[PDB]
């Protein structure tokens, strides 16, 4: 029997690896569950890791290496810049290798194009995207009555941040805020966000929308704390470890929308949080839930692949993913065939002392206040989406 070989292409060492290492934790957790069950096709699934230290250029090299090593599946999620490269390299490889196609399981690169203009049959996205993140965070705040009329948008100047800004601007009229001012800044370079916080203060806003992550959110929060910023951030990634500690005195009341919260789905969500901590050493947050839940859907697909003569057929796996549905600790998870955007609930959460699971050893954690169903959460199929069917 051919074993299934899955390549994780991520930032896996060094000072920029905090997000990539959480992808590693989530991937090892869930592929670990599949392997505890026996793997796939009568063999353990092999997990081949490729430490990418070189951004998109590095990724192209690592994808070539992974495929040469026999990987039939590539997994990645920490950067949409990297994902843009991976998805195109996989698409082009597949055109040249009919019958030997490689799958790209995108567990967290959230830029719109991956299920829009760059959509293709062998890419699947298991995470939110900019539209899902920012519609849900704003609508949730509106439903709760904590969305003021004035907003600022601050994002990183690459595909992801541009998509967040465009989404926040596009939703302003219907949801009901004015984007008073907005900023795109250099990515992962700014060490002092004080001047940006000053600009936000000048705008006299109630909400600051941002898709920032890593230092671009950690240091932004720190600068906001030092300035005593009154506005609350409405985010996709505030529950990355470290942000609430950096928030210090201004921690209360900031907002995030994510696919998960330990208290959002009763005993099921909490049992998952506890099991994940038992295995990894920490409660799941930030990039981890989408990666786990996506790999749960993937595992369900694998169960539904028809027994063959021992060979692994990635087209059959792809069709099984399209057809699969699984009950995750947060509820139903499935895959939209048109664009390969996964359908799943979203939970909007506030930083509060009332949260059962605390963040960063503080008195505060993320407390859920609104859950949108899968139907309420998933974005419309993008106008730019076209997908070729087999084949």
Decide whether 221 or 287 has the Cβ nearer to Na ion. Answer: 287
Interaction with Na ion in 320-379: which residues (CB under 5 A)? 337
Strand ranges (DSSP E) for 36-121? 46-51, 73-76, 103-106
3-state secondary structure of 75: strand
Q: Is 16 in the site for Na ion (CB under 5 A)?
A: no
Stretch near Na ion under the rule CB under 5 A, chosen from 280-288, 298-306, 313-321, 323-331:
280-288
Taking the complex as a whole, the smallest distance from the CB of residue 312 to Na ion amounts, in Å, to 24
Helix (H) or strand (E) holding 372: strand 365-372
Taking the complex as a whole, the smallest distance from the CB of residue 92 to Na ion amounts, in Å, to 23
Distance separating alpha carbons of residues 33 and 136, to the nearest angstrom = 31
Taking the complex as a whole, the smallest distance from the CB of residue 220 to Na ion amounts, in Å, to 18
Taking the complex as a whole, the smallest distance from the CB of residue 43 to Na ion amounts, in Å, to 30
Q: Structure tokens of 288? A: 């981890």
Q: Is 163 exposed, middle or buried (0-12, 13-18, 19+ CB in 10 A)?
A: buried
Contact 119, 335 (CB under 8 A): no
Taking the complex as a whole, the smallest distance from the CB of residue 340 to Na ion amounts, in Å, to 10
Instruction: Give the pairing type, strands 331-335 and 342-343.
Output: antiparallel
In this structure, the dihedral spanned by the alpha carbons of residues 8, 14, 19 and 22, taken in order and rounded to 10 degrees, is: 60
Stretch near Na ion under the rule CB under 5 A, chosen from 105-113, 148-156, 307-315, 369-377:
105-113
Decide whether 341 or 371 has the Cβ nearer to Na ion. Answer: 341
Taking the complex as a whole, the smallest distance from the CB of residue 265 to Na ion amounts, in Å, to 22
Stretch near Na ion under the rule CB under 5 A, chosen from 163-171, 178-186, 201-209, 281-289:
281-289
Interaction with Na ion in 184-243: which residues (CB under 5 A)? none
Q: How many residues sit in the footprint of Na ion (CB under 5 A)?
A: 4
- Determine which residue in the list 20, 108, 161, 345 makes contact with Na ion, applying CB under 5 A: 108
Beta bridge partners, 47, equal 6
Taking the complex as a whole, the smallest distance from the CB of residue 108 to Na ion amounts, in Å, to 3
Distance of CA 315 to the CA centre of its chain: 24
Contact 372, 325 (CB under 8 A): no
x/- binding map, residues 287-316, to Na ion, per CB under 5 A? Answer: x-----------------------------
Decide whether 197 or 289 has the Cβ nearer to Na ion. Answer: 289
Strand order in the sheet with 342-343: 325-328, 331-335, 342-343
Residue by residue, DSSP assigns 328-356 as ETTEEEEE-TTT-BEE--EEEEEEETT-S
x/- binding map, residues 31-70, to Na ion, per CB under 5 A? Answer: ----------------------------------------
- Determine which residue in the list 20, 77, 84, 140 makes contact with Na ion, applying CB under 5 A: 77
Binding site for Na ion (CB under 5 A): 77, 108, 287, 337
């Amino acid at each position: 029997a051919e074993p299934l070989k899955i390549a994780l292409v991520e930032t896996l060492s060094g000072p920029q690896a905090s997000t990539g290492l959480l992808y590693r934790a989530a991937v090892l957790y869930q592929l670990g569950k599949i392997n505890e069950a026996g793997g796939f096709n009568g063999e353990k699934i092999q997990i081949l890791e490729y430490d990418n230290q070189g951004g998109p250029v590095g990724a192209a090299d690592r994808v070539k290496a992974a495929i040469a090593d026999g990987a039939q599946i590539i997994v990645q999620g920490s950067s949409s810049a990297v994902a843009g490269q991976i998805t195109e390299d996989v698409r082009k490889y597949n055109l040249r290798n009919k019958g030997k196609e490689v799958l790209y399981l995108n567990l967290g690169a959230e830029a719109l194009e991956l299920t829009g203009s760059k959509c293709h049959f062998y890419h699947f996205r298991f995470s939110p995207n900019a539209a899902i993140r920012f519609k849900t965070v704003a609508q949730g705040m509106k439903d709760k009555g904590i969305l003021g009329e004035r907003a600022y948008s601050i994002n990183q100047n690459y595909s992801w941040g541009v998509d967040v800004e465009n989404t926040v601007v596009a939703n302003a009229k219907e949801i009901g805020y004015e984007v008073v001012d907005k900023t795109l800044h250099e990515v992962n370079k700014i060490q002092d966000f004080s001047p940006y916080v000053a600009k936000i203060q000048a705008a006299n806003v109630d909400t600051v929308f941002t898709g920032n992550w890593s230092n671009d959110l950690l240091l932004l929060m720190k600068a906001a704390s030092g300035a005593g910023l009154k506005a609350k951030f409405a985010t996709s990634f505030l529950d990355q470890p470290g942000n609430i500690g950096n928030a210090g005195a201004i921690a209360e009341g900031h907002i995030v929308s994510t696919p998960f919260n330990p208290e959002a789905n009763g005993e099921a969500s909490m049992a998952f949080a506890e099991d994940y901590k038992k295995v990894t050493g920490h409660y799941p947050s930030y990039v981890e839930p989408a990666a786990v839940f996506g790999l749960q859907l993937f595992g369900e697909a694998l169960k539904n692949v028809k027994p063959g003569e021992g060979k692994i057929n990635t087209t059959d796996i792809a069709l099984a993913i399209e057809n699969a549905s699984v009950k995750t600790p947060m509820g139903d998870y499935s895959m939209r065939s048109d664009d390969h955007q996964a359908k799943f609930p979203m939970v909007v959460q506030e930083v509060s002392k009332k949260a059962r699971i605390k963040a960063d050893g503080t008195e505060y954690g993320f407390l859920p206040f609104k859950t949108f169903t899968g139907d309420e959460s998933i974005d419309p199929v993008q106008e730019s989406c076209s997908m070729k069917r087999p084949g």
